[PDB]
Swiss-Prot record, chain F:
Organism of this sequence: Plasmodium falciparum (isolate 3D7)
Residues included from the entire protein: 24 to 233 of 262
This protein's name: Small ribosomal subunit protein eS1
Assembly description: Component of the small ribosomal subunit. Mature ribosomes consist of a small (40S) and a large (60S) subunit. The 40S subunit contains about 32 different proteins and 1 molecule of RNA (18S). The 60S subunit contains about 42 different proteins and 3 molecules of RNA (28S, 5.8S and 5S).
Main location class: cytoplasm
NADP keyword on record: no
GO molecular function: structural constituent of ribosome
Function: Component of the ribosome, a large ribonucleoprotein complex responsible for the synthesis of proteins in the cell. The small ribosomal subunit (SSU) binds messenger RNAs (mRNAs) and translates the encoded message by selecting cognate aminoacyl-transfer RNA (tRNA) molecules. The large subunit (LSU) contains the ribosomal catalytic site termed the peptidyl transferase center (PTC), which catalyzes the formation of peptide bonds, thereby polymerizing the amino acids delivered by tRNAs into a polypeptide chain.
UniProtKB/Swiss-Prot annotation, chain G:
ZnF C4-type span: 38-59
Domain of life: Eukaryota
One GO process term, biological-process aspect: translation
Organism, as annotated: Plasmodium falciparum (isolate 3D7)
Entry keywords, A to Z: Cytoplasm, Metal-binding, Ribonucleoprotein, Ribosomal protein, Zinc, Zinc-finger
UniProt-recorded name of the protein: Large ribosomal subunit protein eL43
Cellular compartments per GO CC: cytosolic ribosome; ribonucleoprotein complex
Chief location of this protein within or outside the cell: cytoplasm
Subcellular location as annotated: Cytoplasm
SUPFAM superfamilies per UniProt: Zn-binding ribosomal proteins
HAMAP family: Ribosomal_eL43
Similarity annotation: Belongs to the eukaryotic ribosomal protein eL43 family.
UniProt KW Repressor keyword: no
Subunit structure: Component of the large ribosomal subunit. Mature ribosomes consist of a small (40S) and a large (60S) subunit. The 40S subunit contains about 32 different proteins and 1 molecule of RNA (18S). The 60S subunit contains about 42 different proteins and 3 molecules of RNA (28S, 5.8S and 5S).
Length: 98, 76, 95, 149, 127, 210, 85
RNA sequence: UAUGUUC
RNA sequence: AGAGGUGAAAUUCUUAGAUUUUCUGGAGACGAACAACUGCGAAAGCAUUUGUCUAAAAUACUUCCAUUAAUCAAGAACGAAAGUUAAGGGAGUGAAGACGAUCAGAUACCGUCGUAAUCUUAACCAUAAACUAUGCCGACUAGGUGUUGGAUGAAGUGCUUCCUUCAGUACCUUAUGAGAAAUCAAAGUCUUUGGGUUCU
């Protein structure tokens, strides 16, 4: 029961809060500093994961290494396409912050 | 003679008149003087109102409560 | 016409029981059906006990026991007299 | 029991008193707001009722207010598009299929997945016989993993 | 002074091996069995054959020097049978009456924790 | 035979008798030095005979001949096991037997495998016919006994572990640790075997013999 | 509509060779010509290029695999034992 | 716990 | 200097050292004693440890829905053993086969050996006295002895037993209940014949 809870919180944020999936959108969001959390799939290419991590370290935004690949992250978000990169512009009524 | 039966307390649930075995109680921790509502056979963990303390441990039955304190039925 | 209520074995709430092998003939027999005798015997008789205890040392030697735990099929048990045919009414009695 | 054996009569029996308990001087002017906030925070109505009974001491929301919890959720528009029990069954089926894909040798898991999908089809048929589910709802097993939404 | 050997007794419903070695189990002192004391091609397991088998090894041990013996009792094997043959009784009896001292006695018949399949089919021996 | 000469067998310092037996080899018609034949010989001798007490008659120790000078072999601890008759005696119908095993290494890098056994208790006011424990209780007991064995075999050397094997100080500890979960009757280290030993150190063998 | 009842891709062989031989070759051609999951991009688009080489159409990255499948049970088990430690 | 047909 | 094996033998192994003793390494199968008129599973079936994944059931519930249910032609999943296909494995056992015995004969029972098979993987096959020879759901009808898993209340020493109850699971007795009877707490509540349903 280690991925189920984070999947449930993701369900909650997709339902309530606003978000953005995709490398360009997440990079822009946490460039402007609107990113509260960034989720990286285990499948993410090494260079782009390192770019995301450096960007988030600069922007003081947390990074969560998703346990699944982009395929599982897409289904966790409820989409029918691979994601590999998530930014949450604001959390809804979810406890994903603690 | 099943109409005026009286000692059916030891009878299983859904006796002649099905009544639950659970109840509700007010708990007072010693030296804390707080009032809160509690459910016998509770399934979650509860916290006090005045000072945050542990009250009951949710098990398969009527919980364990604490070593001291006073718990009283809310039945009128 | 169903000689025994239990069908000759002790299977209930169960589908299959692994078989064991008769100690006398080697026949496959279900464990719940095999006749089991746990033999705790002396290594020798009383006369040989009286011989080797006095021929032994420590002056308090106690001979070990033999723990066998044999199991037999119905035919072998009947032939070796571990069980009798018994009468129809006496057939119910176990102990 | 629908499948297998065992009667299992374990359940909860409501008290004879239909009305609000006398000791509850609490006013129902905010109990619906409490359940609405809890659902917004994200709870299925079953666990909403459980949390209400345990942490709030207000058993039988129907007794406190003459309207039941999923009904007030629908009236406020919070109720999910898929009913609770059907969604839980779908989640169980998704988990079972995910496990089976790795372990195709789990014949017992395959059997119980068949049973769960039979239950899913029966209850979905009921829910779409009622207007609680769109008439074209099918539950194909390919995209049920994301159908939870 | 008391000098100890180890007599492995093998009683297997056929000839009764009587095998005295030193404490380590190697460097065997004497091995008599029961097939040489009888020449009827039978009675190899007989109590009588075991008796002479035992007194012969007792005499050889007396002349060799060892005076006390530890019994290691063994029955057939893990798959064949678990009970000692008829010869173990008389082997121990004659070893006792021979005058050489007896120390500790132990059963060491190979006990299979496993269950490798034994001879004959699932219908067993029909004789 | 005529070309065989006796040899004396010695036991380590922590035992009582210090001489348990005699061995014989063949002469040294040199291609074999008649000392390599003696080396690596295992002697199975009862704890009763090694400590002059009948109470320990159910344990037999294996001593492995490791060093030879003049005419007496010296040997060292090689393993232990409880006797078959006692093992069978302490197994009765109506009780559940719990067995556990663990691999440990001492501070001397002595790799051991220890097998312990335990049985449940009737206690006084049971008034029942069986003392079966649930599978969860059995698992907890086995985990507890494995942890106790590994701790009490890893914190110490080999000589003191052998010394504490004599009073069965580990069975008592397992008893007192499992009392609060499920009462256990006679529980003992059924067997200990040496999986691997370090390179032979004649210095240490002699400081433990003296 | 359904074109061949059971021969499937082996309908290219007509009646030649044995039925057992055709069924055996079908079993392995099915997985030789299948697309596999590319663990580097997550898209099921890695196809066989030569006998032991598998290339992903998206990554353009190629891996060494089985003759007819991306992975073989022996190699998978060996990797499992290695990764256990 | 050798074998031992038929009317 | 015999060893195996048998009712007795013989085939067989054995001075090149058989059998036997001890040690080391490898291999495959199996998982004893505990082990039960005990547990789990739809059935077939499931017994070394630990971890992970997965499901089920009972119990407790003042939690949710509110008839969503019962049984089912067709249809579908699973389905012991043997058998088939292809790789691997191959110790022990061992359909075939070969010998040695017994016998009037013995191609059998007994003994020695031994191919396929048994084991794993991936597919087929879909059958068993696959049996409690007893379809599934529901109601009612009687006392006792147990036993497995929960929950309730109380008491010997924080810990153990007794009471009640639910759900399993057996057994004993009893029928002015049934049956042809054996027997059956269901195979009863059937000429005082109709709770529902499928198959034969």
């Amino acid at each position: 029961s280690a991925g189920d809870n984070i999947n449930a919180k993701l369900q909650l944020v997709m339902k309530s809060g606003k978000y953005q999936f995709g490398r360009k959108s997440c990079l822009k969001a946490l460039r402007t500093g609107k990113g509260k959390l960034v989720i990286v799939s285990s499948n993410c290419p090494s260079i782009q994961r390192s770019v995301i991590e450096y960007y988030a370290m600069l922007s003081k935004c947390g990074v969560h290494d998703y346990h699944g690949d982009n395929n599982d992250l897409g289904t966790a978000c409820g989409k029918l396409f691979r994601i590999s990169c998530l930014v949450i512009t604001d959390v809804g009524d979810s406890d994903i912050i603690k | 003679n099943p109409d005026p039966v009286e000692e059916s307390k030891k009878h299983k649930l859904k006796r002649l008149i099905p009544t639950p075995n659970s109840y509700f109680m007010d708990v007072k921790c010693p030296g804390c003087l707080q009032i809160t509502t509690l459910f016998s056979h509770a399934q979650n963990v509860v916290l006090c109102g005045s000072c945050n303390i542990m009250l009951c441990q949710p098990t398969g039955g009527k919980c364990k409560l604490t070593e001291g304190c006073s718990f009283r039925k809310k039945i009128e | 016409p169903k000689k025994r209520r239990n069908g000759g074995r002790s299977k209930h709430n169960r589908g299959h029981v692994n078989p064991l092998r008769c100690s006398n003939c080697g026949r496959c027999v279900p464990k719940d059906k095999a006749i089991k005798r746990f033999n705790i015997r002396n290594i020798v008789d009383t006369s040989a006990q009286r011989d080797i205890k006095e021929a032994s040392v420590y002056s308090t030697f106690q001979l070990p026991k033999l723990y066998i735990k044999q199991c037999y099929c119905v035919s072998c048990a009947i032939h070796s007299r571990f069980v009798r045919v018994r009468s129809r009414e006496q057939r119910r009695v176990r102990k | 029991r629908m499948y297998g054996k065992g009667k299992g009569i374990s359940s909860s029996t409501l008290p004879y008193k239909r009305k609000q308990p006398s000791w509850l001087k609490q006013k129902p002017s905010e109990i619906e707001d409490a359940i609405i906030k809890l659902a917004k925070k994200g709870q299925t109505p079953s666990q909403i009722g459980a949390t209400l009974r345990d942490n709030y001491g207000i058993p039988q929301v129907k007794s406190v207010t003459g309207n039941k919890i999923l009904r007030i959720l629908r009236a406020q528009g919070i109720a999910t598009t898929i009913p609770e029990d059907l969604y839980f069954l779908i989640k169980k089926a998704v988990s079972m299929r995910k496990h089976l894909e790795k372990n195709k040798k789990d014949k017992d898991c395959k059997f119980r997945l068949i049973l769960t999908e039979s239950k899913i089809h029966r209850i979905s048929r009921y829910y779409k016989r009622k207007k609680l589910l769109p008439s074209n709802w099918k539950y194909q097993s390919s995209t049920a993993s994301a159908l939870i939404a | 002074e008391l000098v100890f050997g180890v007599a492995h007794i093998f009683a297997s419903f056929n000839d009764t091996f009587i095998h005295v070695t030193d404490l380590s189990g190697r460097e065997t002192l004497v091995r008599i069995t029961g097939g040489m004391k009888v020449k009827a091609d039978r009675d190899e397991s007989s109590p009588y054959a075991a008796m002479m088998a035992a007194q012969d090894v007792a005499a050889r041990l007396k002349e060799l020097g060892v005076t006390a013996i530890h019994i290691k009792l063994r029955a057939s094997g893990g798959t064949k049978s678990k009970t000692p043959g008829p010869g173990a009784q008389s082997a121990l009896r004659a070893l006792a009456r021979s005058g050489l001292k007896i120390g500790r006695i132990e059963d060491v018949t190979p006990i299979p924790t496993d269950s490798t399949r034994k001879k004959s089919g699932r219908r067993g021996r029909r004789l | 035979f005529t070309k065989k000469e006796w040899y004396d067998l010695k036991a380590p310092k922590m035992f009582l008798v210090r001489n348990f037996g005699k061995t014989l080899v063949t002469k040294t018609i040199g291609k074999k030095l008649a000392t390599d034949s003696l080396k690596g010989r295992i002697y199975e001798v009862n704890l009763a005979d090694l400590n002059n007490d009948e109470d320990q008659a159910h344990k037999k120790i294996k001593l492995s001949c490791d060093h030879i000078i003049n005419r007496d072999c010296y040997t060292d601890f090689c393993g232990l096991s409880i006797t078959r008759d006692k093992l069978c005696s302490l197994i009765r119908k109506g009780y559940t037997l719990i067995e556990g095993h663990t691999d440990v290494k001492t501070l001397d890098n002595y790799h051991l495998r220890m097998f312990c056994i335990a049985f449940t208790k009737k206690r006084q006011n049971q008034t029942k016919s069986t003392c079966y424990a649930q599978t969860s209780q059995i698992k907890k007991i086995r985990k507890k006994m494995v942890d106790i064995m590994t701790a009490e075999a890893s914190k110490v050397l080999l000589k003191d572990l052998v010394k504490k094997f004599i009073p069965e100080s580990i069975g008592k500890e397992i008893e007192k640790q499992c009392k609060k979960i499920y009462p256990l009757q006679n529980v003992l280290i059924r067997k200990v075997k040496i999986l691997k030993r370090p390179k032979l150190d004649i210095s240490k063998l002699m400081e433990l013999h003296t | 509509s359904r074109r061949t009842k059971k021969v499937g891709l082996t309908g290219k062989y007509g009646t030649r060779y044995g039925s057992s031989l055709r069924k055996q070759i079908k079993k392995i051609e099915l997985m030789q010509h299948a697309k596999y999951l590319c663990t580097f991009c997550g898209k099921t688009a890695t196809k066989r290029t030569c006998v032991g080489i598998w290339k992903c159409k998206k990554c353009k990255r190629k891996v060494c695999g089985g003759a007819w499948s991306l992975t073989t049970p022996a190699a998978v088990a060996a990797k499992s034992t290695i990764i256990r430690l």
